[PDB]
Design a binder for these strands. Structure first.
Length: 51
DNA sequence: TTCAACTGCTTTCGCATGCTCCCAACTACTTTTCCTCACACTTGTACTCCA
């Protein structure tokens, strides 16, 4: 389909004009929810004296 | 004059597409905190050879 010109990060989602892919409006709460799902990383200090 | 010219534009369909990793698999040495007791000196109480 012709020739590839460029590529930038916006996304049409509002049946016409676009409302998506605006950068780091959610990244502040992205990398503070990634490392709570898995558990028990064993970076343990006074803990395990107990366990 | 005589001649090319190369640029411009148009149908026909259309064929229609062109600094080097990032992560697996091997492996290895090192990382991290724990664990159970040897060495040696010293101190005691004794009985020896002390005049």
């Amino acid at each position: 389909a012709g020739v590839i010109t460029r590529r930038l990060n916006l996304t049409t989602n509002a049946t016409g004009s676009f409302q998506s892919s605006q950068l780091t409006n959610s990244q502040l709460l992205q990398q503070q929810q990634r490392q709570s799902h898995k558990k028990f990383k064993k970076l343990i200090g006074h803990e395990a004296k107990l366990l």
